[PDB]
Design an enzyme around this catalytic site. Structure first.
Site, PDB file in Angstrom:
ATOM      1  N   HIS A  85      28.958  43.113 -31.240  1.00 19.88           N
ATOM      2  CA  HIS A  85      29.334  43.826 -29.990  1.00 19.88           C
ATOM      3  C   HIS A  85      28.420  43.501 -28.789  1.00 19.88           C
ATOM      4  O   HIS A  85      28.895  43.399 -27.697  1.00 19.88           O
ATOM      5  CB  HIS A  85      29.386  45.339 -30.185  1.00 19.88           C
ATOM      6  CG  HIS A  85      30.564  45.815 -30.983  1.00 19.88           C
ATOM      7  ND1 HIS A  85      31.207  47.019 -30.750  1.00 19.88           N
ATOM      8  CD2 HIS A  85      31.270  45.204 -31.970  1.00 19.88           C
ATOM      9  CE1 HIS A  85      32.220  47.142 -31.597  1.00 19.88           C
ATOM     10  NE2 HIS A  85      32.301  46.043 -32.326  1.00 19.88           N
ATOM     11  N   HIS A 247      33.911  40.502 -41.509  1.00 15.42           N
ATOM     12  CA  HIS A 247      34.541  41.503 -42.365  1.00 15.42           C
ATOM     13  C   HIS A 247      34.270  41.228 -43.840  1.00 15.42           C
ATOM     14  O   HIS A 247      34.686  41.974 -44.704  1.00 15.42           O
ATOM     15  CB  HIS A 247      36.033  41.633 -42.009  1.00 15.42           C
ATOM     16  CG  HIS A 247      36.256  42.276 -40.650  1.00 15.42           C
ATOM     17  ND1 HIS A 247      37.466  42.256 -39.980  1.00 15.42           N
ATOM     18  CD2 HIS A 247      35.377  42.890 -39.808  1.00 15.42           C
ATOM     19  CE1 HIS A 247      37.330  42.843 -38.801  1.00 15.42           C
ATOM     20  NE2 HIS A 247      36.079  43.261 -38.683  1.00 15.42           N
ATOM     21  N   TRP A 298      36.741  46.137 -46.571  1.00 15.24           N
ATOM     22  CA  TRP A 298      37.487  44.902 -46.766  1.00 15.24           C
ATOM     23  C   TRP A 298      37.229  44.199 -48.106  1.00 15.24           C
ATOM     24  O   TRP A 298      38.114  43.501 -48.614  1.00 15.24           O
ATOM     25  CB  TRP A 298      37.196  43.906 -45.648  1.00 15.24           C
ATOM     26  CG  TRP A 298      37.459  44.371 -44.272  1.00 15.24           C
ATOM     27  CD1 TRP A 298      38.604  44.268 -43.600  1.00 15.24           C
ATOM     28  CD2 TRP A 298      36.544  44.975 -43.379  1.00 15.24           C
ATOM     29  NE1 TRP A 298      38.499  44.760 -42.369  1.00 15.24           N
ATOM     30  CE2 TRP A 298      37.231  45.204 -42.194  1.00 15.24           C
ATOM     31  CE3 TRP A 298      35.222  45.354 -43.474  1.00 15.24           C
ATOM     32  CZ2 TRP A 298      36.647  45.795 -41.095  1.00 15.24           C
ATOM     33  CZ3 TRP A 298      34.617  45.921 -42.376  1.00 15.24           C
ATOM     34  CH2 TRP A 298      35.334  46.178 -41.213  1.00 15.24           C
TER      35      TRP A 298
END
Ligand code: HEM
Ligand code: HEM
Ligand code: NA
Ligand code: NA
EC number: 1.11.1.21
Lengths: 717, 717
Positions: A85, A247, A298
């Site tokens: 981010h 992920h 995930w």
């Protein structure tokens, strides 16, 4: 409405809401910086023990804190998301965003809905910041924590560059016009995203993880993923590698209803000590954490690198379902894989799940071919992810000279806009004096030499530190054809002539001294300014620092350089089509990208007008009777109440300045007249237009010009 | 709503409207300043040729320009109005406004309705600015042109001091909450005008010239006149002298419908070159001029000083009538004095006329006694107007050391808060050392000494540069009784002990050396700080500049000093009743008045807390175990995520900070916790709370301390 006290934000823009804001030219003022003018981050970082730092961050990662317990006993994956981010606000259109300033710790980014829980993540790193102090910036530490998380969980990274200097107030950036968090007023057409934006909704990093506008169609999500990642400089291989790589770790959080989550950090009460999103669902942390509202794990190894993500993605069939908080996500059909996915706090196993944007990697046919291959070739996924992650974390670092410390790999990378090393000795004073003479005798005019050097150098932007005159790329695609640069062909005469001078000087030179094309472009401008200053009755010397080198076409990614084309340059009185705002705003925006103060912008505009730097040598703002002379005439005439200004009857963005005779004495653009009209700019004009001001103006002009020439010269500072 | 680009004003304030605005601590940033870092305005103006300056202003005043033709062939009266308006924004409650910074040339003041046409007045003066350049500030020139205008038209002034330093961006001041020009939302009770305001309506200088809210009642206008002038430091005699002396010259302008007047300067198009109020009535200027919309010529001699104003005021009876633009004014009854008042451009003579507010001077009974006395003894008017005019245009100048040049009168003035001349040799290095020792041996505590020095010094406000430690007023009325200074009488013990050290030092002193009480107050703080820093392991010397002198009570206007009383001082954790905002806002406001940056405010809060400077020695924010030790414990503890903070159960402005057991370990106020909560301030706390930061903290604390101790020391600058 009501006006507020200044300490609560009241001011002049309340009364004149669209007024030009000159504060964009004094961002991060020295007086707000606690470190003091001698502070030298490069010298401090050089001192750090990187192995110890790495061990200190591993200890943070495995030591759970009770105010935010660590999923699976490891904060690594939270730290990868943190780092992703931090770098993931970068946009190519203006080079703003990204991790290079540590802006995730300030408003608005610290409080974006997509950065929920990163308040706790950053807070977890205080013990490391506390121990290293001035040797380690928050900026470096946030992305270095992600890199260390990757390595501690089994993924060997390509390297890391230290060197991001902390800032002390937020970079103010246009993130879109929506005044509601997660609002969308940025699309038109079929699905055209408003430039310069690179996310689909206000306060998201790239796309909505439940699909465009919350509707979980993975094919349509792919369109968004591909466009936003392109605008963050990632192609199809990079984008798939990054999503799969990320992920591979961690989980989302959506244990309960989002309306139990309280205000974001900038709006939260004092006793929260800068944290936000305080939740009343259960304990509000850990087993009960709510971050995005999705509840996806995930892989069956959330704290280990392996190929499980793609094995699960392709090993199950998927059906829509809803998270405990009412968000769309996908789960395996037919009850397959029940119990196979581990719980973060020792609960029972759970079923395979995926985001709508993860199915995009299987549904979209381009991503499908890429990721199907990695299913059988994890070694290629590892290679692509290492390259894209390195790029991601360093995209806004600028020239490789700036990357510090012992983990910088030596391999050149096309996306870094590489220039060759210096291979010969450099011109010294005598050789520089000689070349100044050759240039002045070459038949190139003051206006040609100054415009060419300005076009080369002013391509730099201080946002992501790309562009500038190093590389000599003015003679390569695409700069050699940019409209602002080469209106009617004259650029190629200058290039050819300077190439002839390089060639002759290099044929004859003292020993192993050679000069680059790139250096002569800049040196011609300096020599031309010396000439103009003479013309005006000043004997001066324009500083010049050799050392630029000449990139090749192959070292010059043409598509990547497209975003550096100016659509406006008020320094050359150039205004193309498609700008978001009128010309005087674009001027300040251009001055901001060039790191110029308002005094610096002002003197540059006045000097360049009278030197003939205008695009197509138009007379707009050329307020002087003298040819190629460096006077303060611009300032003097702008202030002359003998001139009556009016918009041209052509309605062509120009103005006519009539004397008492009623004859048109001057003409100008909005960029020209704003210096006479705006009360703070006109205050600066009055400094440079006074009777005692001519030596000051020359001195300040030369200093500002020297600044612009050196903007990308991190090789020598 | 829509969010705007930063270059158009957009920013974080849009997302969190009430957020604390730290930009008030970096105003007039060095980077916006075009002048050198070595630029010293005082040095420049000290060499100006004042006689030549005066001749050049006199020539401007009698040379009519076509774009704004001079009434009666003389711009003097316009310049007097200009200077009066430049100085007339001043207000006592915070000391902001006034002519000291040339703020009339920037937003919002340059566009206030009361300042209509002074855009032209200021523009008339550019030839003078141009000629004198850096030797003459706009700020000095605007008021000096009014002073010359007076002398040019026959009124001998008391004197003039140069030295007002030009600024490059407007002072951002709270002028009221109204979001409409001329709006009024600032009265409560019977007629209590909102503090800190000193005008009856948004964008007026003092009162409405057609009477309160446009009702032309002279007696009720007098109530407003008296109170607004009182809030600009003028009593009844001074107020009557100012109005009479001013309206002795010139005329109003209201020739036509006001709806024919275009936008104010900040709202006008580029081509008007910073002028506003462009008028389509007739020619727009001169004989068709429209400024206020009133059309009054007060005297038969508008370009000459004499007693005509009061002879006219008292020699006619008056009746209400309307100007050409429809505004209320007064005109002589029964056709008396028809044709006696001359026209500005040679037209027919007109009748006597007055403003409603001029009649106030005859109808109000206090003013009537004053002004009838001047009808009968006019030489008294000339003396009161000189004094009052001098005070008006110098009120915000600060200590008289700042006044420069050959026109500065020698005479001492009470309202200047004067201090004695230095009359003995000053303490040098050895005496300063010896006094530090004697102070540390006197029995006074570190808390007592730091508190007293802080009290004396932090009464300075950088708006009008009043207050500070010079003068030793901490022991005189009213400072000695201010609640924040002297909660329960402990100040008097400190005072007595420091007087005992003064007297015994001076009667033993070497040679002609003597020390003032005022210096010992500051010196005591300095010695306590050296003692406290040694307790924490640092051996530092606190700088100290001797030379303060000790004023007497007769030299200390008790009422004038009332406005310097703090109702909030976050540096002492003091919050009185009546503040307009919550305590963290009052803190930054106090910092702004102290001229502190965000780093300086931060280190001072943290140091003063652990030194025991808090009001009433409360433990709020005293986040340390050590007594009388200069450590960075404030910052370290604030960042301790082992402390959980909550508002205290008593709703009383305080918080409890509990550690792991649940026991209350610390308590703090909103001022303490904002440093842990505000994302920009917490960044600074993180510098000073790092393991490496103790030496830097002590050093920055001491430098910030020194700054505050020297705020009023214009005698050594
Ligand atoms: C199309 C692009 C992406 C989308 C839509 C997306 C979406 C999300 C969402 C909704 C979360 C859950 C936040 C929460 O509730 O805690 C998440 C977590 C995460 N993201 Fe992604 N992401 C994207 C790309 C990436 C990339 C490129 C990386 C890293 C290279 C990454 C790394 C992570 C990691 C490691 C987590 C787990 C955080 C934790 O374990 O606490 N993501 N992402
Ligand atoms: C109760 C206080 C006052 C009120 C209501 C007031 C009001 C006004 C108004 C409405 C004008 C007309 C502006 C225009 O239309 O051109 C004016 C002009 C003027 N004011 Fe006053 N004023 C006051 C106090 C003062 C003071 C204290 C001075 C100077 C010491 C002063 C000096 C002048 C002068 C010289 C002019 C004429 C300007 C010219 O000839 O262009 N005024 N005033
Ligand atoms: Na995994
Ligand atoms: Na007169």
């Amino acid at each position: 409405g009501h006006m507020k006290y200044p300490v609560e934000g009241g001011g002049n823009q309340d009364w004149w809401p669209n007024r030009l804001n000159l504060k964009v030219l004094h961002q991060n003022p020295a007086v707000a910086d606690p470190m003091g003018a001698a502070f030298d981050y490069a010298a401090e970082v050089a001192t750090i023990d990187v192995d110890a730092l790495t061990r200190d961050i591993e200890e943070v990662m495995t030591t759970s804190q009770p105010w935010w317990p660590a999923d699976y006993g490891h904060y690594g994956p939270l730290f990868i998301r943190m780092a992703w981010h931090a770098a993931g606000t970068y946009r190519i259109h203006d080079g703003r965003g990204g991790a290079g300033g540590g802006m995730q710790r300030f408003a608005p980014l610290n409080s974006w809905p997509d950065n929920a829980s990163l308040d706790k993540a950053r807070r977890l790193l205080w013990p490391v910041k506390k121990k290293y102090g001035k040797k380690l910036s928050w900026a470096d530490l946030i992305v270095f924590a992600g890199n260390c998380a990757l390595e501690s969980m089994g993924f060997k990274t390509f390297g890391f560059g230290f060197g991001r200097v902390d800032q002390w107030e937020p970079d103010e950036v246009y993130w879109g016009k929506e005044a509601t968090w997660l609002g969308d007023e940025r699309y038109s057409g079929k699905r055209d995203l408003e430039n310069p934006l690179a996310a689909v909704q206000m306060g998201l990093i790239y796309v909505n993880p439940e699909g465009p506008n919350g509707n979980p169609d993975p094919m349509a999500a792919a369109v968004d993923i591909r466009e936003t990642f392109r605008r963050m400089a990632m192609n199809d291989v990079e984008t798939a590698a990054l999503i799969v790589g990320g992920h591979t770790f961690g989980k989302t959080h959506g244990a309960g209803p989002a309306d139990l989550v309280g205000p974001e950090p900038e709006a939260a009460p004092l006793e929260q000590m800068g944290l936000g999103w305080k939740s009343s669902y259960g304990t509000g942390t850990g087993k009960d954490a709510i971050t995005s509202g999705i509840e996806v794990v995930w892989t069956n190894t959330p704290t280990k690198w392996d190929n499980s993500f793609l094995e699960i993605l392709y090993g199950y069939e998927w059906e829509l379902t809803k998270s405990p908080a009412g968000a769309w996500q996908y789960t395996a059909k037919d009850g397959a894989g029940a119990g196979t996915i581990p719980d973060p706090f020792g609960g029972p196993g759970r079923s395979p799940t995926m985001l709508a944007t993860d199915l995009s990697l299987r549904v979209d046919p381009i991503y499908e071919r890429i990721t199907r291959r990695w299913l059988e070739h994890p070694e290629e996924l590892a290679d692509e992810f290492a390259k894209a992650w390195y790029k991601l974390i360093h995209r806004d670092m600028g020239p490789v000279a700036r990357y510090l410390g012992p983990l910088v790999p030596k391999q050149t990378l096309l996306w870094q806009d590489p220039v060759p090393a210096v291979s010969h000795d450099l011109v010294g004073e005598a050789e520089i004096a000689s070349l100044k003479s050759q240039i002045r005798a070459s038949g190139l005019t003051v206006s040609q030499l100054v415009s060419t050097a300005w076009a080369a150098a002013s391509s730099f932007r201080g946002s992501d530190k790309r562009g500038g005159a190093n590389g000599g790329r003015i003679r390569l695609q695409p700069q050699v054809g940019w409209e602002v640069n080469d209106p009617d062909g004259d650029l190629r005469k200058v290039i050819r002539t300077l190439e002839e001078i390089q060639e002759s000087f290099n044929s004859a030179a003292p020993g192993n001294i050679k000069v680059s094309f790139a250096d002569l472009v800049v040196l011609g401008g300096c020599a031309a300014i010396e000439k103009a200053a003479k013309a005006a009755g000043h004997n001066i010397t324009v500083p010049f620092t050799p050392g630029r080198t000449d990139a090749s076409q192959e070292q010059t990614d043409v598509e990547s350089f497209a975003v550096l084309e100016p659509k406006a340059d008020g320094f050359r009185n150039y205004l193309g089509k498609g700008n978001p705002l009128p010309a005087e705003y674009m001027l300040l925006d251009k001055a901001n990208l060039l790191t110029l103060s308002a005094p610096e912008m002002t003197v540059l505009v006045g000097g360049l007008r009278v030197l003939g730097a205008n695009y197509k040598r138009l007379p707009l703002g050329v307020f002087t009777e003298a040819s190629e002379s460096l006077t303060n005439d611009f300032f003097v005439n702008l202030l002359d109440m003998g001139i009556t200004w009016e918009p041209s009857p052509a309605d062509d963005g120009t103005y006519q300045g009539k004397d008492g005779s009623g004859k048109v004495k001057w003409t100008g653009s909005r960029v020209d007249l704003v210096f006479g009209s705006n009360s703070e700019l006109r205050a600066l004009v009055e400094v440079y237009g006074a009777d005692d001001a001519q030596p000051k103006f020359v001195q300040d002009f030369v200093a500002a010009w020297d600044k612009v020439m050196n903007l990308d010269r991190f090789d020598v500072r």
